[PDB]
Design a protein around this ligand. Structure first.
Ligand SMILES: CCCc1nc(C)c2c(=O)nc(-c3cc(S(=O)(=O)N4CCN(CC)CC4)ccc3OCC)[nH]n12
Length: 297
């Protein structure tokens, strides 16, 4: 958009009243953004930061937060069917739901939460594309550029060390969305859980969990109510077909993706917190739906 248009958008956002988390429904794991305008996703984002006490705990100026959110949004690579602002926004919303409804908040520090939210919203910036097609390598560089860009520095209130720590976690969180990295480190996570040895007090295990949580939120579309999951799966297919430039196999592949990548993760997450069960439940239900189709409806 033009300079004038971007200015009007910022004006509208900054002056808008931010509805409660309840009104926005961002606490629900089944949340959908289909009917929301970009402005509304921005208000939802502000609410996430607010109810997670980030605005307060880190002294974020309203205007700066609004500007940073809009700067992240407008900077998403255009013409990408799935990995775009909406997916990033949804990843952040799932993170918020997991921290609140999933009750994972009290297990993390304010800096880890700060970093996780920022990474969720920024992880698909500078999307380049590429089975092995779902093995994308993410890029945290643009995330940091925007975070450090004049007028958008929402971490300005952090001490030198808090800032250095936050950036380290942000980098780890973004890289964690690389499925190759998830596949590489998940074995350790699953075994710790299986042997009742999972310990969040252990720095290494805390870091491992944060990476697994990023993956869970990044793939959460697979847990949504059927009609919603069906539409987002179309977006996924469209993105791959756009790179290509078939469909009768989608059902079988969805089941394969769920069985090989998703289910065990949501099952494990449920062990860390039973309240995250909905994600597992939604995933199981979508597997059944896809299996029915695969066996030929
Ligand atoms: C964006 C890529 C990651 C991702 N996120 C979501 C929500 C999805 C999703 O719903 N579906 C896919 C998704 C995953 C695969 S796959 O590469 O894993 N495929 C199935 C498994 N077999 C091995 C047994 C290899 C080939 C294939 C197609 C997919 O989307 C089809 C619409 N990927 N995906």
């Amino acid at each position: 958009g033009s300079h004038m248009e971007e200015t009007r958008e910022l004006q509208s956002l900054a002056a808008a009243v931010v509805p409660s988390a309840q009104t926005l429904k961002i606490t629900d794991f089944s949340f959908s953004d289909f009917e929301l305008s970009d402005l509304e996703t921005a208000l939802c984002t502000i609410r996430m930061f607010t109810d997670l006490n980030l605005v307060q705990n880190f002294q974020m100026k309203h205007e700066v937060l609004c500007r940073w959110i809009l700067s992240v949004k407008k900077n998403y690579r255009k013409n990408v069917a799935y990995h775009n602002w909406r997916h990033a926004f949804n990843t952040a919303q799932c993170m918020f739901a997991a921290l609140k409804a999933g009750k994972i908040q009290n297990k993390l520090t304010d800096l880890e939460i700060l970093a996780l939210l920022i990474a969720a919203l920024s992880h698909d910036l500078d999307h380049r594309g590429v089975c092995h097609s779902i093995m994308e390598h993410h890029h945290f560089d643009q995330c940091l550029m925007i975070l450090n860009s004049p007028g958008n520095q929402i971490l300005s209130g952090l001490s030198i060390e808090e800032y250095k720590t936050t950036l380290k976690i942000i980098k780890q969180a973004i890289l964690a969305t690389d499925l190759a990295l998830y596949i590489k480190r998940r074995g350790e996570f699953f075994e710790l859980i299986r042997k009742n040895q999972f310990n969040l007090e252990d720095p290494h295990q805390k870091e491992l969990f944060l990476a697994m949580l990023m993956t869970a939120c990044d793939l959460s579309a697979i847990t949504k109510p059927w009609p919603i999951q069906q539409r987002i799966a179309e977006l996924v297919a469209t993105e791959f077909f756009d790179q290509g430039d078939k469909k009768n196999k989608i059902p079988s592949m969805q089941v394969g993706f769920i069985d090989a990548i998703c289910l065990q993760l949501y099952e494990a997450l449920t062990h860390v917190s039973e309240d995250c069960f909905p994600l597992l439940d939604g995933c199981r239900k979508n597997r059944q739906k896809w299996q029915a189709l695969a066996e030929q409806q």
